[PDB]
Write a protein that binds this ligand. Sequence first.
Ligand code: FMN
Ligand code: FMN
Lengths: 98, 98, 180, 180
Amino acid sequence: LPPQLREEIALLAVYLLSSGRGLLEEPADYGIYRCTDGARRALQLLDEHGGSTARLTAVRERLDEVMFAPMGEDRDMGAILDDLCRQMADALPEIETP
Amino acid sequence: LPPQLREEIALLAVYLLSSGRGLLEEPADYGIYRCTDGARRALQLLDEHGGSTARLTAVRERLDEVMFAPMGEDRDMGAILDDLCRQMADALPEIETP
Amino acid sequence: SLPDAWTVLKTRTAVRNYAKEPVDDALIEQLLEAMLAAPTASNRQAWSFMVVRRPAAVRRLRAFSPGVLGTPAFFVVACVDRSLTDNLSPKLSQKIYDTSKLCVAMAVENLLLAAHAAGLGGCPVGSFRSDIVTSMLGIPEHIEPMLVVPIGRPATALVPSQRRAKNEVVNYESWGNRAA
Amino acid sequence: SLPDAWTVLKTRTAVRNYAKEPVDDALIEQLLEAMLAAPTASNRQAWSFMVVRRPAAVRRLRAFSPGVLGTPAFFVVACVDRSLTDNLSPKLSQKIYDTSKLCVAMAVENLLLAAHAAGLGGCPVGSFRSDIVTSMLGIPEHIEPMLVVPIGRPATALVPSQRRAKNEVVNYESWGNRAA
Ligand SMILES: *Cc1cc2c(cc1C)nc1c(=O)[nH]c(=O)nc-1n2C[C@H](O)[C@H](O)[C@H](O)COP(=O)(O)O
Ligand SMILES: *Cc1cc2c(cc1C)nc1c(=O)[nH]c(=O)nc-1n2C[C@H](O)[C@H](O)[C@H](O)COP(=O)(O)O
């Protein structure tokens, strides 16, 4: 594995571990964004090394808008997550290994 | 990127997205294990391609015991997460890219 | 030799660590034949089941099932067939639709017992994204997925769970008589 | 000798004709111990069970259970304990309340398997008057009866049922592939 790639996975592991611990001292609607930000970082890892085809990018760009929006906005998190799950499901066959 | 590696990152993204949505219909102490299982899968991704040196493995093996333990056991999740964060912090300099 | 039933029934434990060694097709067919002998309401058999085992499909279904730990040999998905339960008023529909699921759970239990008697392991998982798997597997609209169960060979030794004493959950002839 | 599990799992049939010969207490306790090994969601064990066997109480419960045919040796009533499933919004309550019943059905299946391996018979019955038995047995309000199962020695020979072929209810890797 390339040294930069190796670091990126490990630093992703620290974020998930740190977020999990810091969920004991934060509100109840916070594991939603930690997982949403975790999915954002995994897909951001792909296109930084040339692994996003055409729709793996369109989800990371929509994940960006939801994550970087100003706080306090009344967003239906259930509806957008359902749509993103549907989009990402349609993109897996393009990268399927036989 | 190797085709198997490309799939593994994307399937990790689906898990975080699916867990985030399914956190709206599950108890309040469930984002703890989703992040702990997310950190388990990121480190499991490293040693499956030869990226775990000596302590990146000792955390994924301790993460396994906590995750695979029978449910209902009274475990101090704060103490073990603090220890794992401390161990993982000591292992980053070994893989630091200059 | 084939195990005596009473030792097997007590020993079954949820298995979440599975080994890479795959399960051959004849064993899968025999387990599926053993699991269809469950009771069904009025002999209606209002259920559907699916077997996923291709190495790519098992890992794609695993991602959309956050409650599943470890990568099993194959997946069995149990559903309730709603086509054979609608009649007259919606009250009767609810009455014959809950009972339909109560009988589907028994088939899953039979499957786990059969797959444990053979030296494998399994655990029912209910926390999964229903719509996504329905779209992925091509399941029609009148068939509703209920439970996703992985089956495979345990990777580590089995470890029992901790359960409340018999007195706490069982009463004789009246509520509160945990002695008779 | 104790039966091999695979022959026992296929042979279990619903028994509705029971003989007058009673079942001794040690066997009842052993069957109850075998039936508590079922899986439960998150190891919560949100269930309650009751054993009725006094000759008068079994016949009074039988009348209020029209779906029960024949007079068994004893009755086991399985309920879901709702005290340990309420939390936050009612949506989570429904989510953790359906799953609670899905695990209670498995215990009934285990009980029938254990009582068939011993030479007895049984059949789950869902058509019963819920409120009347709750009042008669003193069951509190937070405990909801689900299934009433009679257990006893079969009076006549066992006769299997007629079931749809494996192809009809099982598909491989896609909806419609009843071959692979
Ligand atoms: C699963 C189930 C079976 C029932 C139920 C309810 C449920 C949830 N209720 C029954 C009832 O009220 N009366 C009755 O006679 N049987 C009931 N059953 C069992 C079912 O009818 C039989 O088991 C089936 O029809 C015969 O199959 P078999 O192979 O066991 O003979
Ligand atoms: C009955 C049931 C058990 C489940 C379910 C759902 C139902 C309806 N869902 C589970 C899940 O999503 N994840 C998981 O790990 N287990 C699930 N289980 C089983 C249950 O958690 C275990 O079987 C139990 O906690 C341990 O008991 P054991 O004696 O078998 O080890």
